Design a protein around this motif. Structure first.
Motif, PDB file in Angstrom:
ATOM      1  N   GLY A  41      47.793  40.226  25.531  1.00 23.38           N
ATOM      2  CA  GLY A  41      47.830  40.379  26.765  1.00 23.38           C
ATOM      3  C   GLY A  41      46.143  40.272  27.295  1.00 23.38           C
ATOM      4  O   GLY A  41      46.105  40.256  28.522  1.00 23.38           O
ATOM      5  N   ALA A  43      49.342  48.626  26.804  1.00 27.23           N
ATOM      6  CA  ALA A  43      50.049  48.147  25.906  1.00 27.23           C
ATOM      7  C   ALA A  43      50.037  48.980  24.547  1.00 27.23           C
ATOM      8  O   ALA A  43      51.154  48.895  23.705  1.00 27.23           O
ATOM      9  CB  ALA A  43      49.526  46.503  25.543  1.00 27.23           C
ATOM     10  N   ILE A 100      35.675  42.954  30.036  1.00 25.16           N
ATOM     11  CA  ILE A 100      35.337  43.108  31.270  1.00 25.16           C
ATOM     12  C   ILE A 100      36.084  44.061  32.068  1.00 25.16           C
ATOM     13  O   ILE A 100      36.614  44.232  33.230  1.00 25.16           O
ATOM     14  CB  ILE A 100      35.146  41.942  32.201  1.00 25.16           C
ATOM     15  CG1 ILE A 100      36.373  41.140  32.134  1.00 25.16           C
ATOM     16  CG2 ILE A 100      33.876  41.055  31.368  1.00 25.16           C
ATOM     17  CD1 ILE A 100      36.255  39.534  32.804  1.00 25.16           C
ATOM     18  N   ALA A 101      36.691  45.032  31.340  1.00 26.03           N
ATOM     19  CA  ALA A 101      37.616  46.263  31.994  1.00 26.03           C
ATOM     20  C   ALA A 101      38.870  45.714  32.430  1.00 26.03           C
ATOM     21  O   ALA A 101      39.457  46.204  33.358  1.00 26.03           O
ATOM     22  CB  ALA A 101      36.737  46.959  32.738  1.00 26.03           C
ATOM     23  N   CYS A 102      39.699  44.900  31.745  1.00 26.04           N
ATOM     24  CA  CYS A 102      40.747  44.253  32.412  1.00 26.04           C
ATOM     25  C   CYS A 102      41.874  45.214  32.432  1.00 26.04           C
ATOM     26  O   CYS A 102      42.598  45.302  33.136  1.00 26.04           O
ATOM     27  CB  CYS A 102      41.250  43.030  31.653  1.00 26.04           C
ATOM     28  SG  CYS A 102      40.086  41.578  31.694  1.00 26.04           S
ATOM     29  N   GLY A 103      42.027  46.195  31.294  1.00 24.65           N
ATOM     30  CA  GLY A 103      42.809  47.279  31.240  1.00 24.65           C
ATOM     31  C   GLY A 103      44.056  46.995  30.602  1.00 24.65           C
ATOM     32  O   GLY A 103      45.178  47.872  30.964  1.00 24.65           O
ATOM     33  N   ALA A 104      44.351  45.691  30.186  1.00 29.04           N
ATOM     34  CA  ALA A 104      45.567  45.587  29.697  1.00 29.04           C
ATOM     35  C   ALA A 104      45.799  46.244  28.578  1.00 29.04           C
ATOM     36  O   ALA A 104      47.241  46.681  27.943  1.00 29.04           O
ATOM     37  CB  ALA A 104      46.004  43.982  29.638  1.00 29.04           C
ATOM     38  N   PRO A 109      43.038  39.566  28.778  1.00 27.47           N
ATOM     39  CA  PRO A 109      42.597  37.880  29.320  1.00 27.47           C
ATOM     40  C   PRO A 109      41.410  37.516  28.929  1.00 27.47           C
ATOM     41  O   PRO A 109      41.137  36.195  28.891  1.00 27.47           O
ATOM     42  CB  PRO A 109      42.582  38.562  30.874  1.00 27.47           C
ATOM     43  CG  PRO A 109      43.333  39.519  31.110  1.00 27.47           C
ATOM     44  CD  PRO A 109      43.111  40.270  29.778  1.00 27.47           C
TER      45      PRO A 109
END
Ligand code: COA
Ligand code: F3S
Length: 81
Positions: A60, A20, A12-16, A62
């Protein structure tokens, strides 16, 4: 060897991940992550120099959409689920 892939249905495009491990994960036109090593098919062995970054992204995320395995996924992010 290690292989990695993004399950695009749970991302869902958390972008972590891209932050990283920028040499492994990037985002498509819809903002969804994918593995640039092999067009998100989980078939290219992750370079040794990138394992630590991969692990950072794997830990990382989520949504646990980043997968890591010891055998190729052959395109199926849920092969080992
Ligand atoms: S997940 C995307 C859809 N969700 C939202 O938009 C959620 C709004 N955000 C939140 O409620 C929190 O961001 C999450 C992490 C979803 C729930 O919090 P957690 O307590 O599980 O905690 P973390 O804080 O450890 O997450 C840490 C990391 O997430 C990455 N991160 C957080 N916020 C962002 C934004 N906005 N953009 C990019 N990355 C973001 C970071 O990579 C960070 O983790 P690292 O482990 O340091 O890589
Ligand atoms: S939700 Fe998607 S954007 Fe990366 S951190 Fe997880 S794969």
């Amino acid at each position: 060897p290690k292989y990695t892939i993004v399950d695009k249905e749970t991302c869902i495009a958390c972008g972590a991940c891209g932050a990283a491990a920028p040499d492994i994960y990037d985002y498509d036109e819809d903002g969804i992550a994918y593995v640039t090593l092999d067009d998100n098919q989980g078939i290219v062995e992750v370079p040794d120099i990138l394992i630590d970054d991969m692990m950072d992204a794997f830990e990382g995320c989520p949504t646990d959409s980043i997968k890591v395995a010891d055998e190729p996924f052959d395109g199926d992010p849920n092969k080992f689920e």
